[PDB]
Amino acid sequence: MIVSDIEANALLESVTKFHCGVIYDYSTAEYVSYRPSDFGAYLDALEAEVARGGLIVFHNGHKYDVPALTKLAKLQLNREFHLPRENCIDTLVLSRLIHSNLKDTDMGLLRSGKLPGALEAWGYRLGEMKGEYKDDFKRMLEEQGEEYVDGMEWWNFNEEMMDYNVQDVVVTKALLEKLLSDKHYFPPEIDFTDVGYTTFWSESLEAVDIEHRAAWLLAKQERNGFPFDTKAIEELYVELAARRSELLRKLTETFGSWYQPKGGTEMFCHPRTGKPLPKYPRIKTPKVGGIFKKPKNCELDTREYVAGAPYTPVEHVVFNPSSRDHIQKKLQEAGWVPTKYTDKGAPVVDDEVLEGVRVDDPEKQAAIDLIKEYLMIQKRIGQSAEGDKAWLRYVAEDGKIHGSVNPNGAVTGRATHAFPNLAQIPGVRSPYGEQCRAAFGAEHHLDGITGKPWVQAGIDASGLELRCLAHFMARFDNGEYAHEILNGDIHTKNQIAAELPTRDNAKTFIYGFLYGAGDEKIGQIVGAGKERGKELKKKFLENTPAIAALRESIQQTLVEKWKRRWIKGLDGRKVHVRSPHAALNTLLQSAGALICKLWIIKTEEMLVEKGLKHGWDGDFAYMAWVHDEIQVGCRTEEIAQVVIETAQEAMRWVGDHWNFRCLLDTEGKMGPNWAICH
Amino acid sequence: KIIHLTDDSFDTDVLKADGAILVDFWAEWCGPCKMIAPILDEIADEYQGKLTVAKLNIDQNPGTAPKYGIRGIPTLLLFKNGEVAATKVGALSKGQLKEFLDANL
DNA sequence: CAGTGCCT
DNA sequence: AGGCACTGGC
Ligand SMILES: [Mg+2]
The missing domain is CATH 1.10.150.20 (5' to 3' exonuclease, C-terminal subdomain)
Structure with a gap:
C-alpha cells in the first residue's frame, strides 16, 4: 500500500501540466518526491503498485488525482494510464462514510464558517491547503513588491508547492490510519495497510466497498455531464424576463412608491425634556449653514441646511415584488391582519398565507396573485439564468452541465448535489417545469461519430x-x-x-x-x-x-x-440518529438511499459485463442520479431498452442481496429528454 | 389657516397659484416635522395677505415629493409663480423662518 | 442571515 | 425528513 497526492496547474476540467507528486510506501516507510520532469517515473511507480495487487490511497483521488493522471499522461506523454477502481482508496470517501455526522468544505469549495457543527481536523487541513498555499504565495509576492494575480500560484512548479505536496501525504497518511482504527468498519485483527486489494475490500465492512464504487461511478457521471439545451433556456429567459417586467409595471401602478428614513446618525431627543426617543427615526443635525451666507464687511445662503435645524434624512423606495417586507407593508395598509409571525417579529409572507389574505380593495386583492406569480417567476429566473449557480452560468464548452455530487453527503447515506443542484430542477407538474426539464436530455448531445442525437432512458425505483x-x-x-x-x-x-x-x-x-x-x-x-x-x-x-x-x-x-445514537444501515454502516422521533424516518430513508446506491452501481456493472461501454465515446452515459431515479444517455434506442431491462434486473439483484422482505421494482421510460422521461 | 394639499390638488393650489406659497413636505413619523409644525401654525397667522402656508404629507400623497428630489424632512419649498424660489430643510426655529421668509418674500 | 421554495 | 440556493436587508 502506498499513499499519494499530486499538484497540477488547474481543476480537472482544464488541467494540462503535472507539477509534482509524492509517494509514501508502507513497505519501505519512505517518502519520495517527484518533480515536473519525473512524471513518467511517478506513473511507473503507481502502476508498479497495481502490478503487485496493491493499493493506492489519495484524498479525493476518485474525483481528481486519478482522472487527472489519466488526462495528463495522455497530454504530456502520449501515454495510456488507467488506475483500476479496485486498486484505489480515497480518504475523503472514507471520512464521509465514517464521520457521516459531520460536514466538510468539499475540498475548499465551501467556506468553513458557513458549515454547521465541527469539522474533522485532518480533513479540514487537507481542504484548506489550496487557500493556505495561496495566502503564503501572495505573502512572498507582496513581500518582494510584486503584484498578485487571480491564481498564479498554480501556474508554475516551485518548492513551496513541493513542500505542501509532501505535507498533504503526511496528513493523508494520518487520516487514513485514524480511519482504519475504527473497528466497526475495519476488523481489529487485520493490519489494513499491509494487505492486497482483494483482501482490503473483502475483510472490511461492505459499506467501504460500496461507497468507493459509488464515488468512482459518480465521478464518471460528473465528467459525462448532462446535455443541456442552452438556446432553449436563453429563450425561456427572455420570456420570463418579459413577464417579470410586465408584472413589475402593473404592481408599481397598484402599489406606489414611498419614503423611508435612512442615513440618520444622531438620536432624536425631545426638545423639551431632552429625553432620547429611540423609536423615532434617526435624524441628522447640520453644523454648517444659515439663512444668510457668512458676511465680510449679506448675501443669501443658497445651501439648503441650517446649523442646529435637525431633519430626518430619507430615501425614496419603489415597491419591489420580491420584498417580503414591502408586501407585508402594502397589504396591511390595505386592511390585512397578520395571523402568524416569525420568531423575529416579521409577519409570515409565504405563498400559503398570501393565498389566505383577503382585502376589501378588489384591485389589491387581485394584485396578490400577481405577486405570487412574480415570486415564482423570480425563483425560475434565478435558477435558470441570474443566480450565482444558474444553469446558463454552468453550461460548459461541450454543451453540458457538469453538476457536482457528494456520493454520501447526507447522514442517511443519500447523496447531495450542487454547483448547480441537478436534483432540484422544477418538475413537469410545476410552472415552466416542462421547459426546464426538456432542456436537460440526451437529445441535446449529438453522437461524436454520426452526429445523431442520443436517446434517454429514465428509470426510477417504484x-x-x-x-x-x-x-x-x-x-x-x-x-x-x-x-x-x-x-x-x-x-x-x-x-x-x-x-x-x-x-x-x-x-x-x-x-x-x-x-x-x-x-x-x-x-x-x-x-x-x-x-x-x-x-x-x-x-x-x-x-x-x-x-x-x-x-x-x-x-x-x-x-x-x-x-446508542446510531442505527445500523443495510450495509452495516452506522447511521447517526438526530432525534428519537425521526428514528423510523432515518431508518427508512437510509434503506432507500443504500438500496438506490447499490442499484445504480450494479446496473452500470451489469451493462459493462454485457459489453456496453460507459462514455460519450461508447454506448451509454450516466447523466444524473436523483435519489431513487437515474437518467442515462444511450447511443441508440436498442441500447436504451437494454439499460431499462438491466436496471430492473439489478434492482431485483439488490433486493435478493439484502434478503429484502418486500419485492423491489423499477419502471423505465425512453425518450429524448428529462421532461418526457418522467 | 394652513392649506392641506393632496397629490391631485398640488398643481392648481401651488403651481398655478398667485402669490408666495410655502409648502411643507412632512410625515407623521418624523420628529423634526412635529417640531416645526407649531411654528408653521403661527407663521400662517402672521404672514396672512403676503404668503400662504401649505402642507403635503408624503405618505398620503406620494407622487409629488419625488418630483422635487426630497432627501430629508421636513422640507420647505417657497414657490413663486409656479417655480421653486427657495428651499430649506430641517426644523427651523420661528426666528430662522421669519428671516427666510422676509428675505425671500 | 432571515425567510422561502425546489427536489426525492 | 434529507439537501441546495435565491433574494432582500443590514
Ligand atoms: Mg490533493
Missing part, C-alpha cells in the same frame, strides 16, 4: 419508501404489508386504516407520514389542521399495529438519554 417500510414491518406482520403492495392496493388499505375520505388522501397521507410532516399539513388534507391531524395519524397506527411495533422496537434499541 414506491421505494413504502416497500422499505413494508420490509421492516415484515418481522411484525409476516409480509402482510409487502403482500398488499405487490397484489392488493396498499393505498386503499391505508385509506381504511386511517378513517379518511378519498383514496388519494391516504395516497398523500402515507408519503406525508414517511417523509415526515407535522399534524398541520397532515390534517390539512382532511380540511382541519394539526387538530384532526393528531387524530388521523393515531387512528392509522391503531389499525396498523405492525408499524407501532416497529417504532417501539427502534425506540428500545436507541433510548434506554441514549443507549
